[PDB]
């Protein structure tokens with residue numbers, strides 16, 4: 739058997755850098771409540787890849 743020396747099955751998890759008001763988010767303001775994380779690892783400015 740292989741018990742494994744891992745910590746958790748979830749490694750790629752996101753969160754909401756906002757709040758939940760009027761049944762709508764303030765960070766992304768998605769349509770549903772259980773929507774997929776909005777705060778993704780991205781940025782406008784950065785060393786473009788060549």
Ligand SMILES: [Zn+2]
Nearest residue numbers: 754765766776
């Ligand atoms: Zn959000």
